[PDB]
Amino acid sequence: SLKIRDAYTIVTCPGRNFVTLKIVTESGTHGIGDATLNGREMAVAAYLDEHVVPALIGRDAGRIEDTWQYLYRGAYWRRGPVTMTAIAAVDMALWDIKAKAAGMPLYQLLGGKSRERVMTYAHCTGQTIEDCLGEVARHVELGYRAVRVQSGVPGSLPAEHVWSTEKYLNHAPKLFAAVRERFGDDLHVLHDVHHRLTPIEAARLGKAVEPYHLFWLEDCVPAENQESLRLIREHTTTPLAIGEVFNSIHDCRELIQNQWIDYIRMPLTHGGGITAMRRVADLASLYHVRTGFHGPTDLSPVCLGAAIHFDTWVPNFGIQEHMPHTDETDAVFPHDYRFEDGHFLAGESPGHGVDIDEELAAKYPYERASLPVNRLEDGTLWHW
């Protein structure tokens, strides 16, 4: 393997912000990794630019494991979203370089294909239940076998939304009943609670939606305290998914080992890269837990390409979220993964199959954009 000659970040906004890390070896071979942390992007950019990048110069790029441990342990302050995203970007770039050196697409390096295609789900959202059903129909036509459904509840800086738990709990089952009435049983139907309930509230929701057989009920409750899942699991057989806001195996080890969830959602970019996520997937597999990588637009095509490779190999694959990037984003990040009849197909190019067009990236300057916050009707700052 060859030494790192150069490493640098690229920041671009082709429809939204992305941060990318590029590593270049003495042979000229290079790899890239996603470093995007939505709404806190420059924290990661600075973590990389000032503290990590300079330490990479001269390192042996082949030493993926050593580098991961060096950045993880060597930071002294361990775990965290900025921290683990910086580490993920390095890790992804190094796996890219290793696969290129091997002359293999990334999935081959990981252990080869376990499946012929990677099932996705699409976001189907409407203001009304009827609007949502319209979106489902349009996505089913495109070949999506699974859909995440959400509808309105009647009644630069962060936007401020208002929330009512009880109005939502009383309304949500109506959406799922309408989805089943219109589409029947074959369709996989997913729902994202987006952190807003307490455990016994989520247990009530879980029970209420059992007749609709959801693929998963996602992020029922904030789970910094992993025990938060216990009451839900004890009271419902609706499958549960969690973890897009996680960055470490230590955020979910207990959730997994106690069989409190069915799908782990932590993605490559935020969960410490391929190196770390293999270990999470493997722990999950001991307990029948499957992968369900977060895949919003705010993870770049670099992450998506690598995710599709990972998805193609991992035995306990569950599903891959798909929120299509804009044409501008796809142009900045040329890639060889393909979408066909509701599924991804991994690329065959050595590496994870994604590149970055630096000249085109430079046409789209960073523009600050923040995630919304949520407040209760009395003004209480809540979970968004």
Catalytic center residues: 194
Asked whether the beta carbons of 343 and 120 are under 8 A apart, the reply is yes
Question: b/e per residue, 351-383, with b = 16+ CB within 10 A?
Answer: bbbbbbeeeebeebeeeeeeeeebeeeeeeebe
Query: Which residue has the closest beta carbon to Mg ion?
Result: 192
CA-nearest of 219, 175, 215, 214 to 193 is: 219
Using CB under 8 A as the binding rule, whether residue 204 contacts a second copy is answered as no
Q: Which stretch binds Cl ion (CB under 5 A): 77-85, 179-187, 200-208, 307-315?
A: 77-85
Please tell me whether 17 is known to bind a ligand. Answer: no
Q: Is residue 38 marked as binding?
A: yes
Cβ 115 to Mg ion, closest distance in Å? 24
Which residue is associated with the tokens 């996602």?
Answer: 218
Residue 230 beta carbon to a second copy: minimum distance, rounded to whole angstroms: 14
Interacting residue with a second copy among 1, 5, 8, 40 (CB under 8 A) = 40
Residues of span 236-295 touching a second copy by CB under 8 A: 245, 247-248, 250, 253, 270
40/278 with CB nearer Cl ion: 40
DSSP-derived 3-state class of residue 131: helix
Give the residue carrying structure tokens 């309105």: 152
Subset of 322-351 contacting Mg ion (CB under 5 A): none
Task: Calculate the alpha carbon distances from 85 to 28, 262, 330 in Å.
Answer: 25, 24, 21
248 binds Cl ion (CB under 5 A): no
Q: Which of 80, 126, 134, 222 touches Cl ion (CB under 5 A)?
A: 80
**Least distance to Mg ion, CB of residue 292, Å:** 10
For residue 118, give the nearest of 351, 323, 318 by alpha carbon: 318
Q: Tokens at residue 253, please? A: 């080890």
Residue 92, token pair as written in the block: 């992804």
How do the residues of the chain divide into helix, strand and coil, expressed in percent and rounded to 5?
40, 20, 40
Q: Does 82 bind Cl ion (CB under 5 A)?
A: yes
Residues between 152 and 181 with contacts to a second copy, criterion CB under 8 A: 156-158
- Tell me: does residue 192 bind Mg ion (CB under 5 A): yes
Contact partner, 364, from a second copy, Mg ion, Cl ion, none, Cβ < 5-8 Å per class: none
Are 373 and 381 in contact by the 8 Å Cβ rule? The answer is yes
Number of residues engaging Cl ion in binding (CB under 5 A): 3
By the criterion CB under 8 A, which residues form the site for a second copy?
37-47, 49-51, 54-55, 66, 69-70, 73-84, 156-158, 222, 224-225, 245, 247-248, 250, 253, 270, 368, 370-371, 373, 381-384
